[PDB]
Amino acid sequence: PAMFIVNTNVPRASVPDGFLSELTQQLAQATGKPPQYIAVHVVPDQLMAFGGSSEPCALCSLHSIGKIGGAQNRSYSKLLCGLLAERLRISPDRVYINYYDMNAANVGWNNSTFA
Amino acid sequence: PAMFIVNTNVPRASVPDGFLSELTQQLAQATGKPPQYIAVHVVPDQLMAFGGSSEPCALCSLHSIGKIGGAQNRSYSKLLCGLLAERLRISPDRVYINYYDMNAANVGWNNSTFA
Amino acid sequence: PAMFIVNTNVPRASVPDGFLSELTQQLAQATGKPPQYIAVHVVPDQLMAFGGSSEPCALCSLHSIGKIGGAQNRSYSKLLCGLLAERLRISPDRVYINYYDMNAANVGWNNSTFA
């Protein structure tokens, strides 16, 4: 299981059709998890500043049970920044992505947890 | 102290009156913390996908100073999924809840922290 | 690098001009990090309750690579609560701020991570 959130000041109208599906597919592929387990959340029109500037930016999070590590996080960032640059026109240097390796016992789903 | 956030694609109009109060009471009861210390945040109308589908779903978080564990998280999930299913018509298998056991020194409140 | 989020039920119109810039500067100063590395996100008009009440409140997070600790978090809360009280008219005792000391390998930026 893995969840990805994108918080951005880019307007809703600038989020292309298929964006959530593309994120789901690329992340399923990158983490090696079936897409059924990937959840995505996009939050446009946000009041944000990066480095004191209000030009396009994004603050993201990827919580995943496993598949988190030095090298994996580097490829995730390359993939994720490429997508935000191409799709939302956000410069890679105006993006932060926080990675969290979740313990299965700390992720609830379907009336229980993954423990 | 504990805080609970629900991010959902369910429309605002579908959130019943008293929903936040019910969450506050059930969580105070479940964690065994006075309700004065429970904070709740509900965020409807979100652009989300779960397993690649945009049917009703929810991504939630419960940050709590203590009261986090294998068995406790399982009961929290049963309680929380039951509420989302009954109140927001969200299927329990389309819900993720991330649990965080916060250190008191890492939770600020009233100009200081709980350390 | 550090990121700060404020989630509040205070209306958008009550957020003064320059609020995001002030937060950026105060946080750069407080953490001793150049402002270029500080990201800020303010989310008004939220459906929230604190202690069961819907009076003005805020649930915040400060994720920082380092500069997180018992004493530092205490000054951060004093600074942050002072700002929310003065700027948004939020009582310090109706504010929670969760502090996260992020590992550099778990923060992506500009196609890679800070590792």
Query: 3-state SS of C37-75?
Result: HEEEEEECCCEEEECCECCCCEEEEEEECCCCCHHHHHH
Do the chains contact at B109 and C100, CB–CB below 8 Å?
A: no
Distance, in Å, from the CA atom of B99 to the CA atom of C90, rounded to the nearest integer, reads 27
Contacts of C36 in chain A (CB under 8 A): 51-52
Helix (H) or strand (E) holding A87: helix A70-88
Dihedral in degrees, nearest 10, Cα atoms A15, B10, C54, B63: -80
For residues C88 and C85, give the distance between their C-alpha atoms in angstroms, rounded to a whole number.
Answer: 6
SS3 content of chain A, % helix, strand, coil (to 5): 40, 30, 30
Question: What CA–CA distance (Å, rounded) separates B23 from B96?
Answer: 16
Nearest to A95, CA basis, from A20, A3, A4: A4
DSSP output for B31-75: HT--GGGEEEEEE-S-EEEETTB-SS-EEEEEEESS--SHHHHHH
Contact of B5 with C14, CB cutoff 8 Å: no
CB contact A95 to C (< 8 Å): yes
Task: List chains adjacent to chain C, taking adjacency as at least 3 C-beta pairs closer than 8 Å.
Answer: A, B
Number of domains in chain A: 1
Cα dihedral sign, B79-B84-B85-B86: positive
C82-to-B110, C18, C23, C91 alpha-carbon distances in Å = 9, 16, 11, 9
CA C100, C103, C105 angle in degrees (round to 5)? 140
Tokens representing residue A29 in the block: 């592929």
Residue B29 structural domain: 1-115
CA angle B52, B91, B85 (to 5 degrees): 145
How far CA B37 is from CA of B4, B20, B106, C90, in Å, comes to: 11, 14, 16, 16
* Chain B residues close to A102, C-beta within 8 Å: 98
First to last CA, chain B: 12
The angle formed by the CA atoms of residues A40, B58 and B107, to the nearest 5 degrees, is 90
CB contact under 8 A, A59 and C5: yes
What are the CA-CA distances from residue B15 to residues A56, A104, B6, B18, B21 (Å)? 32, 29, 11, 9, 12
d(CA B23, CA A110): 18
Indicate the resolution in Å. Answer: 2.0
Distance in angstroms (rounded) separating the CA atoms of residues B53 and B55: 6
A20 neighbourhood in chain B, CB within 8 Å: 47-49, 54
Give B36→chain A minimum CA distance, Å: 25
Distance of CA B38 to the CA centre of its chain: 10
CB atoms within 10 A of CB A1: 19
Smallest CA–CA distance from B79 into chain A, residue: A111
Q: Do B70 and A115 touch (CB under 8 A)?
A: yes
CA proximity to A2, closest of C22, B52, C88: B52
CA angle, residues C104, C113, B3, in degrees to nearest 5: 60
- Residue C101 makes CB contacts below 8 A (sequence gap 6+) with B106, C64, C65, C66, C67, C68, C69
Q: How many Cα atoms within 13 Å fall on the side-chain side of residue C14?
A: 16
Distance CA C44, CA A88 (A): 23
Give the CATH number of the domain where residue C87 resides: 3.30.429.10
Which of chain C's residues have a Cβ under 8 Å away from the Cβ of B106?
68, 73, 98-101
At residue A69, φ and ψ (nearest 5 deg) are -175, 170
Experimental method: X-ray
- Please report where in the chains the tokens 């929290």 appear, as a residue: B76
Whole-number Å distance between alpha carbons of C72 and C95: 17
